[PDB]
Amino acid sequence: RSGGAGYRQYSGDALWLPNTERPAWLDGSLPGDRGFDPLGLSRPAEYLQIDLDELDQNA
């Protein structure tokens, strides 16, 4: 039957914008992954560790 008659069979990754790129942390493996994370909430977070403040009154 084929088709390509009443529709444009364009090839691409369905994203939330007609042209954009998936964030690095949004691979596309998960169901419903549309590359939608403008705030980067799922971006792997980086943290710094501060040492324990000295609170010894003997010092």
Binding site: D56, Q57, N58, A59
Partner: protein
């Protein structure tokens, strides 16, 4: 007279607070800062 006692009260507070703010570390935090001064010291107890 009022400027004498208001000023004297101001100068006492300023001189006392400035000397206290400049005490050279000679004690720990579990002791009074006063302990850092020994009666008869030949050296200064605060940094002018």
């Amino acid at each position: 007279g009022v400027a004498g006692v208001f000023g004297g009260s101001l100068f006492s507070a300023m001189h006392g607070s400035l000397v206290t703010s400049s005490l050279i570390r000679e004690t720990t935090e579990n002791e009074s800062a006063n302990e850092g001064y020994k009666f008869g010291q030949e050296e200064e107890t605060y940094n002018i």
